Amino acid sequence: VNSFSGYLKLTDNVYIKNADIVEEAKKVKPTVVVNAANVYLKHGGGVAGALNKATNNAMQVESDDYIATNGPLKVGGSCVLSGHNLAKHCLHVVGPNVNKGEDIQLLKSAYENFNQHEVLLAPLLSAGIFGADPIHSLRVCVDTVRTNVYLAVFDKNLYDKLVSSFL
Numbered sequence: 001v002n003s004f005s006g007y008l009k010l011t012d013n014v015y016i017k018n019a020d021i022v023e024e025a026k027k028v029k030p031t032v033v034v035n036a037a038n039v040y041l042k043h044g045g046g047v048a049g050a051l052n053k054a055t056n057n058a059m060q061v062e063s064d065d066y067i068a069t070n071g072p073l074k075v076g077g078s079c080v081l082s083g084h085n086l087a088k089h090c091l092h093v094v095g096p097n098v099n100k101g102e103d104i105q106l107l108k109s110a111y112e113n114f115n116q117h118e119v120l121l122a123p124l125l126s127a128g129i130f131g132a133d134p135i136h137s138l139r140v141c142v143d144t145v146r147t148n149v150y151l152a153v154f155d156k157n158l159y160d161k162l163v164s165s166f167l
């Protein structure tokens with residue numbers, strides 16, 4: 001039993017809710033919140049900008065030190081950093097950005113990072129400003145992630161479309 005509330009169950013291990021991931025993180029304090037990161041951990045907009053703003057820029061400060069030490073992430077890769085006031089940990093995962101021309105097949109590799117964590121609160125990777133089809137992202141999530149994932153979808157219209165079209 002966990003504290004996630006109001007989710008629709010899609011499969012054995014995937015759950016979905018129309019919610020603001022920032023507000024959801026603030027209320028649940030999950031062990032892991034996933035950030036829709038880029039390789040430079042520059043949290044300017046989308047989910048990343050929202051999560052970082054909610055940390056009063058502490059996420060960005062920590063991220064800049066991480067990059068200065070380790071260099072950029074790979075597309076499809078991830079790193080674990082602090083969750084600050086939102087979660088115990090933040091798993092920064094880089095899905096391909098279609099608006100940068102990155103290979104969508106890398107979306108499966110990106111979701112594989114979730115399997116290293118038993119339970120996660122997450123957005124749909126590569127959705128929103130990353131330019132992928134969220135219906136496709138949900139399909140890859142369901143077919144790749146085996147651990148327990150609670151997906152937060154900010155847009156109610158998109159949420160309803162994702163549920164209604166789910167196979």
Ligand SMILES: CNC(=O)Nc1ccc(C(=O)N[C@H]2c3ccccc3C[C@@H]2C(=O)O)cc1
Nearest residue numbers: 036046047050123126127128129130153154
């Ligand atoms: C004050 N609170 C807030 O600003 N919250 C806030 C702001 C923006 C987003 C967002 O862009 N999310 C989408 C996003 C972004 C980048 C990559 C993939 C996805 C999928 C997400 C979705 O469409 O569900 C989510 C929450």
